[PDB]
Design an enzyme around this catalytic site. Structure first.
Site, PDB file in Angstrom:
ATOM      1  N   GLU A   1      52.486  23.116  -3.019  1.00 37.36           N
ATOM      2  CA  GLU A   1      53.948  23.061  -3.377  1.00 37.36           C
ATOM      3  C   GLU A   1      54.292  24.413  -4.361  1.00 37.36           C
ATOM      4  O   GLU A   1      53.606  24.176  -5.084  1.00 37.36           O
ATOM      5  CB  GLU A   1      54.552  21.651  -3.650  1.00 37.36           C
ATOM      6  CG  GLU A   1      55.910  21.681  -4.556  1.00 37.36           C
ATOM      7  CD  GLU A   1      56.440  20.459  -5.236  1.00 37.36           C
ATOM      8  OE1 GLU A   1      55.376  19.802  -5.496  1.00 37.36           O
ATOM      9  OE2 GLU A   1      57.632  20.044  -5.243  1.00 37.36           O
TER      10      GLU A   1
ATOM     11  N   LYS B   1      63.015  21.154   1.020  1.00 38.56           N
ATOM     12  CA  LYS B   1      63.165  19.902   0.621  1.00 38.56           C
ATOM     13  C   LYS B   1      64.407  19.066   0.584  1.00 38.56           C
ATOM     14  O   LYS B   1      65.621  19.617   0.269  1.00 38.56           O
ATOM     15  CB  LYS B   1      62.583  19.689  -0.814  1.00 38.56           C
ATOM     16  CG  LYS B   1      61.841  18.820  -1.392  1.00 38.56           C
ATOM     17  CD  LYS B   1      61.672  18.687  -2.838  1.00 38.56           C
ATOM     18  CE  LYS B   1      60.774  17.285  -3.020  1.00 38.56           C
ATOM     19  NZ  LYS B   1      60.909  16.672  -4.605  1.00 38.56           N
TER      20      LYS B   1
ATOM     21  N   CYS C   1      55.948  16.571  -1.770  1.00 36.73           N
ATOM     22  CA  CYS C   1      55.910  15.847  -2.806  1.00 36.73           C
ATOM     23  C   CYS C   1      56.374  14.399  -2.730  1.00 36.73           C
ATOM     24  O   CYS C   1      55.939  13.711  -1.780  1.00 36.73           O
ATOM     25  CB  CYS C   1      56.475  16.621  -3.969  1.00 36.73           C
ATOM     26  SG  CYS C   1      56.006  15.991  -5.508  1.00 36.73           S
TER      27      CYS C   1
END
Ligand SMILES: CCCCCCCC/C=C\CCCCCCCC(=O)OC[C@H](O)CO
Ligand SMILES: CCCCCCCC/C=C\CCCCCCCC(=O)OC[C@H](O)CO
Ligand SMILES: CCCCCCCC/C=C\CCCCCCCC(=O)OC[C@H](O)CO
Ligand SMILES: CCCCCCCC/C=C\CCCCCCCC(=O)OC[C@H](O)CO
Ligand SMILES: CCCCCCCC/C=C\CCCCCCCC(=O)OC[C@H](O)CO
Ligand SMILES: CCCCCCCC/C=C\CCCCCCCC(=O)OC[C@H](O)CO
Ligand SMILES: CCCCCCCC/C=C\CCCCCCCC(=O)OC[C@H](O)CO
Ligand SMILES: CCCCCCCC/C=C\CCCCCCCC(=O)OC[C@H](O)CO
Ligand SMILES: CCCCCCCC/C=C\CCCCCCCC(=O)OC[C@H](O)CO
Ligand SMILES: CCCCCCCC/C=C\CCCCCCCC(=O)OC[C@H](O)CO
Ligand SMILES: CCCCCCCC/C=C\CCCCCCCC(=O)OC[C@H](O)CO
EC number: 2.3.1.269
Length: 503
Positions: free
Chosen positions: A262, A330, A382
């Site tokens: 990430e 995301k 994540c």
């Protein structure tokens, strides 16, 4: 008798904290049953307000002992005095504890008598609605769900059918009967509890997938171990880029897929065009693909910059283009980390205090799987891997692997990164796909289609994890229906139990 509300709140705290031992670092799965047995038994024969207070203290033990790792994030991010962060951790634990009090309070109101209907029927259905709200209200924080503690346990076979929340359900059910058996000194609920628990065991042997050895590939994941950003200057960007490139260069001819974690590239996507276009050529030359995280600011129609936490693809079968649709932005942002809650406080911003304006933008809920070297990867960045339904909705039957890229350098050397890792393994078992988790430092691994750890490299090191992964194809019952069957079961249990209470 020493049964006094003061004692029950004290024990609720201990049986709640006991639940933390069920999860990833400690891995004592029976601690989940003992934990839920305390919550179930201590709320017996109580006023609805006394039960709610005991449910709250159970949640306070569970979340207080198991969620406290958020402190380090609050400490370094928030910029607050030491005892303020401690207060905020106690605050968060108390907030989550509300839903456990709500569960106990409502359970005691409608089902005050200690009966098997209460524990086996009402409790699991209510718990389902309770635990749904906890992970939904606001953005939701569904951390510490005991279903994940069964990833290696007897109930793992239930997961690919009805999903992890079915293990939440059955555990609340089985623990309820055991609490009833003990309290009422009756062996019949014990027998049923053992049967309900033992029956799912043979399901762990069913393979709803089938492997594809002709598609076996060598995958590489670079654990960059780049430290927290103390000073961003071109000197640190050049160091980061060097670390990752120099580790990728020797793998260019061998590993078909290379993954960076990430925000591995610490500069904007538009500012790296020469670097990425050159890297895309080198990979295509040697017949490889690269999947890396990058922070991408993008001009809207309105001519305003929308900053995304992205995943970009390069190389063979994934030609890099800033306009390419092969990317992942995301969706679910961390409430205080990636965005600011209540943006309407902009009034005190200009007069008086210096308030944060910094907030990320969200991608779509559903996004197509990333294609690299002809491989289909449904990504999750994540925290997103702990959201079961979102990952399943994005999952496609042609998906070869599940992909997670995370940066856990915050919460490092704590239980947090493990509890996170444990929930990522659940996705692989539910969907019967291998999962490729590349992180910055914490827990880089490869997880098989049944949730087994295939390969892993130690934490807080600068390494590359290179191993052979073979994809799977078939569809599990959960991958088809999702948690609809469980919600149907929850409705029938709630229908019966509320109809019985209202008579
Ligand atoms: C009673 C047993 C409670 C043990 C609490 C626990 O699991 O310890 C976690 C620790 O607090 C994490 O920092
Ligand atoms: C918030 C909950 C804090 C725990 C105290 C709740 C409480 O004292 O209530 C117990 C009972 O209602 C009194 O008999
Ligand atoms: C057993 C009760 C567990 C309750 C523990 C709740 C205390 C809150 C807490 O753990 O905060 C400590 C701080 O975050 C440290 O980093
Ligand atoms: C009233 C509460 C409003 C809460 C909104 C204020 C939170 C500010 C924030 O989220 O910033 C945190 C950042 O990590 C540090 O700069
Ligand atoms: C320093 C920050 C502290 C922040 C403080 C606000 C928890 C309630 C509880 O369980 O206590 C009940 C007690 O055990 C019954 O005697
Ligand atoms: C009123 C009947 C419906 C019950 C629905 C309850 C829902 C409560 C949910 C969360 C609160 C949890 C916090 C616990 C606070 C309760 C402690 C309390 O107030 O008990 C004092 C009591 O009045 C001294 O006799
Ligand atoms: C009368 C009492 C019913 C009250 C609430 C039920 C709310 C449950 C309905 C919510 C539907 C589930 C949902 O939409 O969320 C999916 C979630 O991500 C995966 O469980
Ligand atoms: C997510 C999938 C998990 C769902 C699993 C579906 C199983 C439901 C079947 C039966 C309910 C169990 C109720 C059994 C009641 C226990 C027997 C009992 O308690 O009777 C003794 C009583 O105390 C003397 O009057
Ligand atoms: C784990 C604890 C489970 C406790 C289950 C106890 C069941 C029990 O006490 O059985 C009663 C006895 O059989 C009546 O003759
Ligand atoms: C525990 C209940 C689960 C019992 C096992 C049912 C398996 C099932 O759902 O059947 C799959 C069917 O082939 C649809 O793809
Ligand atoms: C009067 C007091 C009532 C107290 C209530 C306690 C018992 C709650 C029982 C059942 C909840 C019913 C919810 C069932 C709704 C089904 C939702 C659904 O259809 O699933 C959504 C979908 O699966 C998403 O992906």
């Amino acid at each position: 008798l020493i049964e006094r509300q003061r004692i029950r709140l004290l024990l609720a705290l201990l049986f709640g904290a006991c639940g933390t031992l069920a999860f990833s670092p400690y891995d004592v799965w029976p601690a989940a049953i003992i934990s839920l047995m305390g919550l179930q038994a201590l709320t017996f024969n109580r006023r609805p307000l006394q039960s709610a207070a005991i449910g709250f203290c159970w949640g306070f033990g569970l979340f207080g002992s198991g969620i406290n790792w958020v402190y380090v994030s609050i400490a370094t991010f928030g910029g607050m005095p030491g005892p303020v962060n401690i207060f905020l951790v106690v605050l968060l634990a108390a907030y989550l504890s509300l839903y456990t009090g709500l569960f106990a309070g409502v359970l005691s109101r409608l089902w005050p008598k200690t009966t098997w209907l209460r524990v086996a029927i009402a409790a699991p259905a209510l718990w389902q609605v309770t635990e749904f709200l906890r992970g939904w209200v606001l953005t939701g924080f569904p951390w510490l769900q005991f279903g994940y503690s069964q990833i290696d346990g007897p109930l793992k076979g239930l997961a690919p059918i009805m999903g992890v929340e079915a293990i939440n359900f059955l555990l609340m059910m089985v623990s309820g009967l055991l609490a009833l058996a003990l309290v009422k000194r009756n062996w019949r609920p014990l027998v049923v509890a053992v049967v309900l628990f033992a029956l799912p065991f043979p399901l762990r042997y069913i393979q709803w997938f089938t492997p594809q050895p002709e598609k076996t590939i060598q995958v590489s994941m670079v654990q960059g171990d780049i430290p927290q950003s103390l000073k961003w200057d071109e000197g640190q960007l050049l160091n980061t880029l060097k670390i990752y490139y120099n580790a990728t260069a020797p793998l260019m001819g061998k590993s078909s897929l290379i993954i960076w974690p990430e925000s591995a590239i610490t500069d904007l996507e538009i500012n790296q065009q020469p670097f990425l276009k050159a890297l895309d050529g080198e990979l295509r030359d040697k017949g490889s693909s690269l999947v890396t995280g990058i922070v991408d600011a993008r001009l809207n129609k309105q001519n305003r910059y929308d900053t995304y936490n992205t995943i970009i693809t390069l190389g063979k079968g994934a030609p890099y283009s800033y306009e390419s649709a092969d990317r992942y932005n995301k969706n679910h942002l961390v409430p205080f980390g990636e965005f600011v809650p209540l943006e309407s406080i902009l009034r005190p911003l200009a007069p008086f205090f210096d308030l944060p304006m910094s907030s990320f933008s969200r991608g779509p809920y559903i996004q197509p799987p990333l294609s690299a070297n002809g491989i289909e990867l449904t990504a999750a960045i994540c925290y997103e891997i702990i959201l079961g339904e979102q990952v399943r909705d994005n999952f496609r039957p042609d998906t070869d692997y599940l992909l997670t890229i995370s940066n856990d350098a915050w919460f490092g050397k704590s239980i947090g990164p493990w509890q996170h890792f444990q929930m990522a393994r659940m996705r692989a078992l539910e969907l019967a796909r291998p999962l490729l988790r590349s992180t910055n430092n914490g827990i880089t691994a490869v997880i098989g289609p049944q949730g087994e750890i295939q390969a892993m490299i130690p934490q807080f090191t600068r390494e590359v994890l290179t191993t052979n992964v073979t994809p799977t194809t078939g569809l599990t019952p959960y991958a088809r229906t999702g948690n609809w069957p469980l919600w149907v079961l929850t409705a029938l249990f709630g229908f019966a139990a509320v109809l019985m209470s209202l008579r």
